[PDB]
């Protein structure tokens, strides 16, 4: 099992070890929020292919792992979630 004391670059970047994420149908900016009520706006600009990969998720929960560049370092980010509405995907992330 991963050691929970391993430095977590999501925590350093957006303020949560397991942030909530959202990806719309009209933008390739991945939103990372420390809470579902948070008002700030940490984003990761996904490439078109990365965003298309998230959008293969259906309305049933599944997982996709993306290699995101945080602080110039490639971090495997594990996105669990689903298509939550006609035009939005959302879930929780870990890293």
Author numbering: 1 to 95
Task: Give excerpts from the publication.
DSFs are a family of fatty acid AIs produced and detected by a wide range of gram-negative bacteria, including important pathogens. The DSF receptor RpfR is conserved in numerous gram-negative bacteria, including, among others, Escherichia coli, B. cenocepacia, Cronobacter turicensis, Serratia marcescens, Yersinia enterocolitica, and Enterobacter cloacae. RpfR was predicted to contain three domains, namely Per-Arnt-Sim (PAS), diguanylate cyclase (DGC), and phosphodiesterase (PDE) domains. BDSF binding to RpfR was previously shown to trigger its PDE activity, decreasing the intracellular concentration of c-di-GMP and favoring biofilm dispersal.
We observed that the undescribed region of RpfR (residues 1–117) was highly conserved among all RpfR homologues. Indeed, we found that a construct containing the first 95 residues of RpfRCt (RpfRCt) was soluble and well folded, as determined by size exclusion chromatography. We determined the X-ray crystal structure of the RpfRCt(1–95) to a resolution of 1.2 Å using the single-wavelength anomalous dispersion (SAD) method. RpfRCt(1–95) adopts a Profilin-like fold consisting of an N-terminal α-helix and a central six-stranded antiparallel β-sheet with a single α-helix connecting β3 to β4. Distance-matrix alignment (DALI) and PDBeFold searches of the Protein Data Bank (PDB) show the closest RpfRCt(1–95) structural homologues to be PAS, Ca2+channels-chemotaxis receptors (Cache), and cyclic GMP-specific phosphodiesterase-adenylyl cyclase-FhlA (GAF) domains; however, canonical PAS domains contain five-stranded β-sheets, and Cache domains are periplasmic domain proteins that contain an additional N-terminal α-helix that extends through the membrane. Like RpfRCt(1–95), GAF domains contain six-stranded antiparallel β-sheets; however, unlike GAF domain proteins, RpfRCt(1–95) does not possess a pair of interacting α-helices below its β-sheet. Consistent with the fact that RpfRCt(1–95) is neither a PAS, Cache, or GAF domain, protein BLAST (BLASTP) searches using the RpfRCt(1–95) and RpfRBc(1–94) amino acid sequences return neither PAS, Cache, nor GAF domain proteins. Based on the above structural and sequence analysis, we conclude that while the RpfR N-terminal domain is structurally similar to PAS, Cache, and GAF domains, it is a new domain with a Profilin-like fold. As detailed below, this RpfR domain binds to and negatively regulates RpfF; thus, we refer to it as the RpfF interaction (FI) domain. Finally, superposing the structures of RpfRCt(FI) alone with the structure of RpfRCt(FI) in complex with RpfFBc reveals that RpfRCt(FI) undergoes minor conformational changes primarily at the RpfFBc binding surface.
